[PDB]
Amino acid sequence: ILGDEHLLGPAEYISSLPSKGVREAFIDGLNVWLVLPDHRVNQLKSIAQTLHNASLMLDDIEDHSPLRRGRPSTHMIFGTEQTINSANFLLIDVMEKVRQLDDPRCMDIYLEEMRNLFIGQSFDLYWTRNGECPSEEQYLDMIRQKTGGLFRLLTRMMVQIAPVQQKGLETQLASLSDVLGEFFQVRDDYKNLTELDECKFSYPLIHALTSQPKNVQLRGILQQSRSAGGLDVPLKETVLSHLRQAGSIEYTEAKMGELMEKITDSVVSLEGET
Amino acid sequence: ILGDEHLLGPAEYISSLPSKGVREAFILVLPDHRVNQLKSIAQTLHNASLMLDDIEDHSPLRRGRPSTHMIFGTEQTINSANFLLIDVMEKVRQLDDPRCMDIYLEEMRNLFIGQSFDLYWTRNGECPSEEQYLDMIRQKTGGLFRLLTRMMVQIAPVQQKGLETQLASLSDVLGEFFQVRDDYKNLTELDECKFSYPLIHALTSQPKNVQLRGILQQSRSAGGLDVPLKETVLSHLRQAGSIEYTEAKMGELMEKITDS
Amino acid sequence: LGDEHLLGPAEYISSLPSKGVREAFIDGLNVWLVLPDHRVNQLKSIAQTLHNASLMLDDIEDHSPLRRGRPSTHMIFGTEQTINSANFLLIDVMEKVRQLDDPRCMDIYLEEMRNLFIGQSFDLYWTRNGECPSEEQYLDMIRQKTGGLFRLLTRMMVQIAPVQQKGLETQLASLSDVLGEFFQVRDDYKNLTELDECKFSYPLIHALTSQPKNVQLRGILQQSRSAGGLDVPLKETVLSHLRQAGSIEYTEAKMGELMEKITDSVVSLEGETGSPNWVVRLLIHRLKV
Amino acid sequence: DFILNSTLSSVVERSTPDIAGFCSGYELRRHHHEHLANEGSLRCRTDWEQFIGPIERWGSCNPWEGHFGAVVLPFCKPERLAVICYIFEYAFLYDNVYRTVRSILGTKQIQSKMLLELLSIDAPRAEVVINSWKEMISTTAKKDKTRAFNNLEEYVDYRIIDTGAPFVDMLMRFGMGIMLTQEEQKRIEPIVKPCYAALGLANDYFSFDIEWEEFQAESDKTTMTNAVWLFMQWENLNAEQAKRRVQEVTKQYEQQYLRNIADFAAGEGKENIKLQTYLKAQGYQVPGNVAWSLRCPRYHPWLCKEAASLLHQILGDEHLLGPAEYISSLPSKGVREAFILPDHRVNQLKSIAQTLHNASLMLDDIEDHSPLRRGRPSTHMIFGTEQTINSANFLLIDVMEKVRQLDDPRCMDIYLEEMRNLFIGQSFDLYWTRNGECPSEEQYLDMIRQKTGGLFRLLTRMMVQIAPVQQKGLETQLASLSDVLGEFFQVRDDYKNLTELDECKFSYPLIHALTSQPKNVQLRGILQQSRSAGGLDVPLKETVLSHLRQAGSIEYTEAKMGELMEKI
Amino acid sequence: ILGDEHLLGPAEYISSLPSKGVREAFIDGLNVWLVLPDHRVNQLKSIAQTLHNASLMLDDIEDHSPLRRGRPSTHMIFGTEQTINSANFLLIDVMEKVRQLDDPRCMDIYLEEMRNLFIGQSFDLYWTRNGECPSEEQYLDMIRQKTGGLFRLLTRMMVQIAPVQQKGLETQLASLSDVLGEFFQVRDDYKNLTELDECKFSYPLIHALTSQPKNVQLRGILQQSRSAGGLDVPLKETVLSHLRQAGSIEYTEAKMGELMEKITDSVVSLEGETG
Amino acid sequence: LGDEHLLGPAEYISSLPSKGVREAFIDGLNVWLVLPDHRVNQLKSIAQTLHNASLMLDDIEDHSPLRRGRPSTHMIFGTEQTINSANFLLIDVMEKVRQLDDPRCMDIYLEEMRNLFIGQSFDLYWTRNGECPSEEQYLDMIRQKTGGLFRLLTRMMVQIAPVQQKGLETQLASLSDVLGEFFQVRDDYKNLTELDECKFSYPLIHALTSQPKNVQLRGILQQSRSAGGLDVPLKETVLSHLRQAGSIEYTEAKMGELMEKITDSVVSLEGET
């Protein structure tokens, strides 16, 4: 009838797994600049945790990943439909917490940044389904919304409840959020490749396909993955060998270095201001 | 990337299919603009529900035409449904009333609990009772009607404030009637092992019927039933006396719906 | 037609390494019942054939690729041929009971095989439909499935036994029933401690009963049902859910109680006979201690 | 203190330089808590006649120092001391070995009582003694006494195990209980044997005197295999000359053992006390053997009584009968009922036929992957495969309850033989169906005489047995009729299923097509496609029909029916 | 134990099937202008028939077509591997057939034309497997080589075998053959579409995908075709409705009319510089 | 445009590591036949291209995901593109045989290719239908399938060979057939000692012939035929059956007997020259 045990089951499962906690560390780091009450910071951390959990729950069915952190995924314990149902309700649940922050403007930020996140994820899903390689500009504009969406969403809701005074620090913090969202995705791509199964594009894999327009081997191992469903170890070694010859990994290291210089410059400028 | 063509695609496709407009016809002296706003909210919520339900039932067709997940994929349809929820959120905001927000959130919570119970019963093959099944369809199906009626009463010019309870009861009875009718007009005209009022009566009145339970189990681990198996299921339901046990419910619900 | 293709699946399973629990049980009971070597060997053949047919059928109805580490009979001869050989083995055993020179041995056979088939039918119904039985229902079933061959052999031995030893029948039947319960709870314990076919057990029943709201265990069991077996990480999660409800200790308590009953019954039998039975107690030692 | 605490046991005090010219100044110890060792043999003896039977041999017991297991090895732990005396007495009496059947059951109760107590305390510690026990018993069995052997050097290593040294050795191992590595044993095996041989050779040497009398008593005895008696034929002498011969021969190689203790393990690595203590333990028993064997009754029996006198102080049936009633509710044709004596006997036979046919149909539907039967869903789609198999087996068991009420023992054998033939036929059918093997015409016709004519033969023979005595000369005629009738039914079924083989079943027309045309590759390819994919699509079926009709196989089939029909 | 019975086998089942005789009729067509003897005509016709049979046998495998002319395909009676083997041997058989024409240049012609045919087929396969939409120019270039290759082969060998005199009328005949193959392919596409199961790109489909690079529905249905290895009736009707809105069935009739104008002009021109 | 899709699979299979048995055999024959270097390189090109096409096709017709520890060609380019490239390779070699400046070099090519295709056809038919050939039938097949390239190369070399080389035609051809037979038996031995594609071999044919009633072996072979391959315990069971039947010793004796003929033929050829 009404027990609400089949709704929060999947939500509670994913919320009891090991996690890095980068989203909460970002809030803690920002709270130094914007002095805020512990109550508000904890509310924002809960919001970020719920949004992250919903995103993780959804992005596992769309990747057919049986395991998460060595533990089984949520849809392998509850079912795909139940996981979708709980994830679509976590959006409503967060909607009641943004409304408890006592600010009419906080709902506008929520409703705009969520739309940006959904646009980015929609583009990622399209490029995954239809194997169309995007340009570097396109890929860098997706991950500034798909991954930098949560950081920007948290930042804009925190400079609004920030006590008076500091209001000028809006553009700088937003740029920091975007650069961090870019860095945290290039880093994950580099880590995953140097140390693709679901035929997912990455920054190193676009450079290879762009610099080498006549590489017919790469474009065929990229299609065997789509057709069969995944690449075995012998084919993954071939893909890594093809990427090692185009200088894609060096390109990725250069991009990461360039991004980190921007991060440190923004941090030093912000520290100078405050 | 500032495009909306891969996010709004499935939403436009599901809104182009032919419909019956039950929710719109359901929709207190209200100004016309408010009525159009409420109709848009109802339509968008129904479209999202259909988009999600077609996936959770592996239905290749909807009203004769293809389903949304066979033209755009599963994941894109899911993303579009989530953004449709966000868009309904935006639409409720424009109604210019603080108290519509709480109504929307509470009704969505109830609708999701009902759908969760339905999904649990369908996946695990656990047969609900009469009371549990009749309480699940007061939320999964009557949730939209209750949501709309509570929203309409609030933004209606004063006077009509004591009729919230009566209209809510009317909405619950209406949702029950719709679900029981759709159960009836599906056997007196299953492949995903969906329970129903006739099926529950048959399985409860007969605690030792092994044939029906075996056919249902075959349906579960086959992806669906063929024509002979569906025919024997119908014969079992007809012999158990559940086609007119359901016809008594449809009359009893019509008695309540007529009174209030 | 020259035989073969019929007693080939039967001979493949008779050439595999075994243990000899039933044979040792017969030799342990013979010191109390006292039978000629001919009759004891005939009963050994009957028990061996019946156990082999049971294993042949169990492998098919469990989708088990291997048995004792070696390939199964139906992966070398086909499902249909194995079924045919198993059906013929029942007719073959029914030819050996007739050579025991007793009309009353046929009634015992035909009345205990019915109980065997009833217990196995309930096992199959619960496995296929996903229904979870109660502890009483589960314990009663394994008193007919696993403790039926022991009872069958026992009731045949107390009928060919020379005149006098015939009042010791109810005690021996109870001993066989408790042995059949013990041999199944032990396997249930051993498999878990060190579900691919959605098989129920004492720990799993306890976990499902004590926790009416554990939605994760009921979820992984359904995943197993809908995927033809669990993976190793899901198996570890199922096993971990069974150490938080106390199922592993509940199974050991049941095992201890069963062993106490076995020891009490053996002591009573060794007292109402006058002969200490040092071969059945070595079998008890080989089991747990 | 993890060393040998020899405070509970002490050496024997004797002023002589050495008794009987053996074991000069060796530690022949005696245990002060020896009272447990005494009953150990007596408790065993009480078990024997209670399980095996009466004894007339007294055994091993002397008024002097003590038992052979007492003097030789008193270095046991206080608790694990009497369990060994139980083993020794059985071994010291086993060499000599309806009521015969009862005697055997007694043996299984002695070879398990000793095993129980020994294994109970510690199995890995225990397993050593049984492992040595297994090979020890077997070795002496193989050596035939009628066949002789060669020089004493090759003799001793047979004898060192034949009477058996490692037996006492493995109990000493059982005394202190250190597990030893596998390969390190091998290099020290030639270290222990010189001690073992000298240890073992004494036993027989003292025991020679009593072994002699036995040969004269037994005529059939071929040889008294014994080391010292081997000198009697090899080096012919009076008698006591051979007793002198080895009196110091063993004495000569034990002196070697003192070196081995002080050698490399305890030499260069003198500060390696964990290993150096291990070596010493082995050489303690040696003085023990000569003590007891000196004058004991077992070896010198003159004491007899003097030794004895001095020493006297579920409701069920719903998941079983679920697939069976479903298949019995589907429409039938009444072919076997019409084929089938007072009315009750006829009804009993009709019930038997119906149940057997239902079981056959249930089993056959599973092995055809056929979802439908008479337009109605098959049984394995309402109850599954395993439940249907269970019900099919129980139906075979149940028919037996029906057969036994016909009041005829010679109806219990007809049923079994006919079912054997039915299963043979079905086995050949299944083998040909699976392993893509086309039978010949004769093989196919033989198979369908048993798979399909088995039921008719069974019913006819049962009816002849049941029927009044006068009309019993038919039998053969009716059986031949039934065989032809079943053949006709099978050929008809093959013919009709073609005019108007989704599982690649060999029919009568198909065999003709395959045999008359050895070079037809299209038909064979289509059959293999059916085997692999699972079945045939409609144009494939039409091309199969075209290939069969071109070869004139349907006209062949119709000729068989007219031939079969004429015989009927 | 030396019979050639499992090799020639698949090559006879495909020959037994009914045909339309386009290649034979074409061979008869250029024979009035070239006037070469009957035995040479029969040899050329046998070469063309064998090449067409090999092409059909390979094509049916590379598309999973259970049926051909209403009857089952060759790889459902002999399997895939034996069909591939027979297709590979039919090339060698055709090349034994060519040397009997008693002209060294026939071998060079044959080798060049088969190189072109294999290039065209390679591009067709790459576009089909990788889900890459060709442009109009690329598609028209491919169908000029894959489909017009056989006609060009036959006409180039015919103008070489034929009795002396007339030799300058080679380029015109090659142009005619290329245009004719283009027409055959476009006609086949139109007939199939009006009256992509294996994700095959056509002229109307290319036009629709080029005209509206925002139609996500068409692209999604084309991807569903690839994912499920085929399209059902409602999805095919939806694709046809999409093509009947972007003016793809009308942009195809103009191409066919232009190809007929070219064919008629080429025939007329090749009727003036002869007798 | 270009041939980037037609020569893809050919170049990929050329890149992979090889042994060089064909090139070594050509070099070995050269000491008797004394061809110029240019012709020897032309023949090496022909042999390499033919071998590569053969491997490309064999991997397809045997569902082998791997080749020498590296991914197969049809796992990178698809089955259709690989078949197309193999056919173009068959075409391309015929443009190389035509560059040897001898009309008679083409009839040899056509006849030996016919023989090779016949042998492979019998192999494929036996594999698909699950029919066990006889020893004579099996040995006649491999004398054409794997003894075909050797015979082709030998005949072309003797045809190009500068004058003389009269009697060195039949002896060298017999050497080629024996050598191909020995290579196939050696490969069968190696595969066995250190079945997934239901492939018959000398040990397996011997076992199924010496034992007319071994039902277990036939059942395991049918299970391999149906399921798609043998998992490890079933492969161990087949190996145990073969060891019990004595097939391994039969194979080793056959290998020794073939090597004796190889040695005698080589000694005789050296003796004549």
Swiss-Prot record, chain B:
Bifunctional terpene synthase that converts dimethylallyl diphosphate (DMAPP) and isopentenyl diphosphate (IPP) into variediene as a single product. The C-terminal prenyltransferase (PT) domain of EvVS catalyzes formation of geranylgeranyl pyrophosphate (GGPP), whereas the N-terminal terpene cyclase (TC) domain catalyzes the cyclization of GGPP to variediene. The PT domain can also synthesize geranylfarnesyl pyrophosphate (GFPP) from the C5 isoprene units in vitro, while the TC domain is able to cyclize GFPP to the sesterterpene (2E)-alpha-cericerene. The chain holds residues 405 to 681 of 705 of the full protein. Isopentenyl diphosphate binds at residues 20, 23, 46, 63. Mg(2+) 4 binds at residues 53, 57. A motif (DDXXD 2) lies at residues 53-57. Mg(2+) 3 binds at residues 53, 57. Dimethylallyl diphosphate binds at residues 62, 140-141, 179, 186, 194. This is Variediene synthase. The conserved DDXXD motifs as well as the NSE/DTE motif are important for the catalytic activity, presumably through binding to Mg(2+). In the N-terminal section; belongs to the terpene synthase family. Residues 1-260 are annotated as: Prenyltransferase. It comes from the Eukaryota. Hexamer.
